Amino acid sequence: SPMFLPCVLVPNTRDCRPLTYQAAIPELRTPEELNPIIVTPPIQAIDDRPGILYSILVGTPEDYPRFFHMHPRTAELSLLEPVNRDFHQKFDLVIKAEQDNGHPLPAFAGLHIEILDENNQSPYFTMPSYQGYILESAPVGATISDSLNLTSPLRIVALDKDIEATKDPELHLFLNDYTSVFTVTQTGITRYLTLLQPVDREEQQTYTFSITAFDGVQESEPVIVNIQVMDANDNTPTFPEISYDVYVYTDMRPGDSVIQLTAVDADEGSNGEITYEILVGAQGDFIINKTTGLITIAPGVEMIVGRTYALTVQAADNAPPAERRNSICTVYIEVLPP
Numbered sequence: 512s513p514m515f516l517p518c519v520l521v522p523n524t525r526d527c528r529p530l531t532y533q534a535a536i537p538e539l540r541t542p543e544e545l546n547p548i549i550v551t552p553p554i555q556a557i558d559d560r561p562g563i564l565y566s567i568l569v570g571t572p573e574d575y576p577r578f579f580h581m582h583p584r585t586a587e588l589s590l591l592e593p594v595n596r597d598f599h600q601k602f603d604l605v606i607k608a609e610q611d612n613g614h615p616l617p618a619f620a621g622l623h624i625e626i627l628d629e630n631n632q633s634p635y636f637t638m639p640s641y642q643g644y645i646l647e648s649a650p651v652g653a654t655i656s657d658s659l660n661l662t663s664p665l666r667i668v669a670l671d672k673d674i675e676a677t678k679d680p681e682l683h684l685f686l687n688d689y690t691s692v693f694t695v696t697q698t699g700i701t702r703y704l705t706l707l708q709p710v711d712r713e714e715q716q717t718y719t720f721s722i723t724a725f726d727g728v729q730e731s732e733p734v735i736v737n738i739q740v741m742d743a744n745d746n747t748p749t750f751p752e753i754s755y756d757v758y759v760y761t762d763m764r765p766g767d768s769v770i771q772l773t774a775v776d777a778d779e780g781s782n783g784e785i786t787y788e789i790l791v792g793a794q795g796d797f798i799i800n801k802t803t804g805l806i807t808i809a810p811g812v813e814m815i816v817g818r819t820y821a822l823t824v825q826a827a828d829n830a831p832p833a834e835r836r837n838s839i840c841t842v843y844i845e846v847l848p849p
């Protein structure tokens with residue numbers, strides 16, 4: 512005698528379509544968070560004070576009394592305990608409505624409850640840290656490499672147990688620093704780092720920062736990244752001045768310090784290693800120390816009063832010839848009397 516609502520007509524007949532009500536419950540969430548359980552459409556039977564009592568007649572699996580209670584007058588559905596989807600994926604219940612006047616003529620309707628999977632696993636990186644390498648002469652857009660050889664790209668793999676293994680988890684990656692220097696690719700299971708701006712080893716040789724993944728709900732633990740900027744020979748050995756006027760004296764004798772030249776090269780290792788050489792002009796009377804740049808009188812040589820000299824001095828770094836850099840200094844020497 513009571514009918515569940517809505518009554519959806521079965522065309523070409525006088526019959527109401529039997530109802531299967533629908534609810535859905537986020538796995539592992541609590542009653543307090545979820546209650547009351549929203550049912551679509553809302554549960555209601557008709558014939559203030561309806562005089563109708565609602566209850567759950569039967570359901571499968573038979574665990575359901577442990578998880579659900581229905582209010583007799585309101586048909587309100589209350590969760591009693593959080594549901595683990597590993598153990599329970601769904602419930603199918605039958606709802607009874609009957610009159611309370613003492614003449615029950617029960618009606619029945621279905622209620623289907625889905626237990627929903629949720630984004631409830633934090634994303635994660637498959638390494639505890641990442642070491643990258645980049646040459647300072649690399650252009651914008653260059654990919655950071657995973658080795659000194661610079662032959663293969665630094666691979667950053669971010670996964671998420673909420674997503675299928677072979678499927679892209681579509682994570683967002685936050686950098687905590689240097690976001691105007693480096694950027695991370697925005698799609699894919701494997702991410703890479705590229706240059707937004709050229710880097711100069713002589714300004715900064717190392718970059719340390721961390722990356723955090725985000726799945727729309729939870730963040731990963733931050734993962735630490737170090738990037739090493741490798742030297743290019745892009746600095747030239749440089750004297751303080753183009754030329755130097757210096758005077759020597761008749762009394763001076765072989766071995767005596769004539770002048771100390773000092774050039775500067777900011778590059779790393781042998782790229783910054785300077786070698787000095789007199790190309791021409793010493794006329795046998797002066798020599799220079801290959802590594803110190805100090806010029807002195809040559810052995811078995813005496814100054815003559817009038818003599819002048821023009822020494823052409825070269826400073827070069829010890830990069831391979833193809834990349835070698837040098838500059839020239841000219842040293843004018845005149846002998847004087849004390």
Ligand SMILES: [Ca+2]
Nearest residue numbers: 632671673726
């Ligand atoms: Ca997740």
Ligand SMILES: [Ca+2]
Nearest residue numbers: 629630631673
């Ligand atoms: Ca999940």
Ligand SMILES: [Ca+2]
Nearest residue numbers: 711712713745
């Ligand atoms: Ca440089």
Ligand SMILES: [Ca+2]
Nearest residue numbers: 746778782828
């Ligand atoms: Ca150099």
Ligand SMILES: [Ca+2]
Nearest residue numbers: 742743745778
């Ligand atoms: Ca350099």
